[PDB]
């Protein structure tokens, strides 16, 4: 009865809004008014205001919907979003964010704003600067709602990812400060979104983000330690990846500044059980090709004797073997000779793994087999003078 | 669940950005060690650069298409804009110039059909001769 009726009305609305001639198409009529210099500015303002009510109205129905009628509103919604250009859409939508009192409508409205910029280019640089400032200002207001806080963070992540460098520096620095503060948010959703922004923000800023470095790496390492403890967290996998991607991003952008804390980076990689080994191995290939090998070899000895030797974890041991072998096949001859006392000291520890190893014979033999090949490879690429004392 | 889906989206997006090849988020211990060691060299051999290239082109084609929709749409309105100002005598200085170019454009084409002046000199001379005999009118 009334359900059948509303189905037909939204169909009737859908037909008119559908972009099936200058006169018939609503979209073309709007742009003409915009293109007219003689068209009254107040008339333009009416179009902006009328759209915001129209956009809010359709979102209200979709929020409060019935599968077929749900789908029809989206065809209506799709037609609505294309009525006016990105320039006026942002102008007519950003004020409505604060005006809207429903968390759902705000949640919906943030998503569409990001979609409008998914297909834009350099012409939107002035517009996105306005959008970023508004999103930055609303977040302290929207801290109460996790979903709204999460989405606004992620829309910023998309906009910083896309032509973020072209954005004015003040917004970029402001975003990094804001994301860093919310890394401490108790909600796992805010942490992962906060972590993602820092990666893109640090990627854009590069060395200029070094000022925030004490506020990024040390808390992230502490977060990982808490991540292991709360294994009941449903977002443990995403969070652990979220910490790993953070290090991977800055391993390419700030290798030199991370070498001091490289040991904690390796600790995260070694013991990130939830993350897939492919991700963990891939980030290792980033460390070798970006960070000085000599510092790496020094750290492998410390971490092995501390944790991996007593870890009794197959993945941690195996991935440690991946780091050690990769370094030797890439370390230079000059670097090779200099770091000899440390490697051999580590090498003796590797032979003595069998005494403390809790694994079965086959694993230890396989582990020893790898150790021998790497040890032979490293002793080659050396000279007699350095090796005779060590022997 | 929205937290779940949104959590996967943000992490998955950066995996592509930073690690193109790695998959996205959705037994004897000795065998496990061997697999990880094997997995390195084959991952080390992956052509991630091509994977980056394929994504870049796909994003470029759609973005290319959307502007081609953008400009193609606005000339339609621009020409529509020109029509009413001309009818209402609201032509701007720019409007009076684009139409003036069309006067030059359309006229310039018709000269080719109009033909060149020299041939008209021979053609006209032939024209009167054929006319006078047929029309006569000397009488």
């Amino acid at each position: 009865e009334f359900l059948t009726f509303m189905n037909n009305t939204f169909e009737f609305i859908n037909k008119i809004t559908e972009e099936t001639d200058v006169r018939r198409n609503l979209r073309l009529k709007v742009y003409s008014v915009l293109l007219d210099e003689t068209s009254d500015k107040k008339l333009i303002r009416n179009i902006r205001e009328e759209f915001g009510t129209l956009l809010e109205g359709v979102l209200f129905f979709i929020n409060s919907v019935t599968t077929e009628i749900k789908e029809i509103l989206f065809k209506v919604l799709g037609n609505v979003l294309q009525i006016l250009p990105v320039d006026e859409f942002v102008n007519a939508v950003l004020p409505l964010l604060s005006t809207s009192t429903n968390e759902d409508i705000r949640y919906h409205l943030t998503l569409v704003i990001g979609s409008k910029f998914e297909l834009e280019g350099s012409e939107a640089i002035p517009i996105v600067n306005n959008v970023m400032k508004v999103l930055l200002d609303r977040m302290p207001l929207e801290s109460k709602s996790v979903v709204i806080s999460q989405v606004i963070l992620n829309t910023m992540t998309a906009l910083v990812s896309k032509y973020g460098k072209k954005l004015e520096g003040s917004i970029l620095t402001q975003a990094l400060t804001l994301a860093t503060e919310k890394v401490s948010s108790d909600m796992t959703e805010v942490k992962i979104s906060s972590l993602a922004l820092i990666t893109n923000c640090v990627q854009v800023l590069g060395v200029k983000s070094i000022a925030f470095y004490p506020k990024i790496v040390p808390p992230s390492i502490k977060l990982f330690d808490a991540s292991l403890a709360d294994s009941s967290n449903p977002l443990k996998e995403q969070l652990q990846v979220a910490i790993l991607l953070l290090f991977a991003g800055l391993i390419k952008r700030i290798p030199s500044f991370l070498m001091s804390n490289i040991l904690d980076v390796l600790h995260v990689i070694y013991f990130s059980r939830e993350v897939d080994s492919s991700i963990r191995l891939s980030v290792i290939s980033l460390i070798i090709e970006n960070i000085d090998l000599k510092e790496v070899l020094k750290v492998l000895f410390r971490i092995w004797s501390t944790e991996i030797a007593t870890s009794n974890d197959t993945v941690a041991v195996s991935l440690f073997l991946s780091t050690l072998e990769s370094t030797v096949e890439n370390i230079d001859k000059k670097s090779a000779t200099s770091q000899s006392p440390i490697f051999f000291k580590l090498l003796l520890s590797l032979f003595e793994f069998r005494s403390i190893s809790s694994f079965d014979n086959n694993t230890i033999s396989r582990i020893e087999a790898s150790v021998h090949e790497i040890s032979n490879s490293y002793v080659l690429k050396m000279n007699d003078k350095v090796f005779r004392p060590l022997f | 669940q929205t937290s779940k889906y949104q959590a996967t989206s943000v992490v998955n997006g950066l995996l592509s950005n930073l690690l193109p090849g790695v998959p996205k988020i959705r037994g004897s211990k000795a065998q496990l060690i061997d697999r990880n060691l094997k997995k390195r060299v084959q991952l080390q051999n992956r052509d991630v650069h091509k994977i980056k290239k394929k994504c870049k082109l796909v994003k470029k084609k759609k973005v290319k298409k959307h502007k081609l929709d953008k400009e193609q749409l606005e000339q339609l309105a621009k020409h529509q804009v020109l029509k009413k100002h001309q009818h209402e005598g609201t032509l701007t200085d720019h409007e009076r110039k684009y139409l003036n170019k069309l006067i030059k454009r359309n006229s310039q084409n018709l000269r080719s059909w109009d033909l060149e002046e020299e041939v008209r000199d021979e053609l006209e001379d032939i024209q009167q001769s054929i006319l006078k005999d047929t029309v006569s009118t000397a009488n």
């Binding site: 989206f74 799709g78 759902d104 919906h108 998503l111 569409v112 979609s115 | 669940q1 929205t2």
Partner: peptide
């Protein structure tokens, strides 16, 4: 003819996120 007949035969993401939120 039946043999011939056998031969003849032989020869939006915003929408989804919106809907997902409604389920919540």
């Amino acid at each position: 003819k039946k043999q011939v007949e056998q031969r003849l035969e032989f020869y939006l993401a915003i929408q989804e996120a919106m809907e997902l939120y409604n389920k919540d």
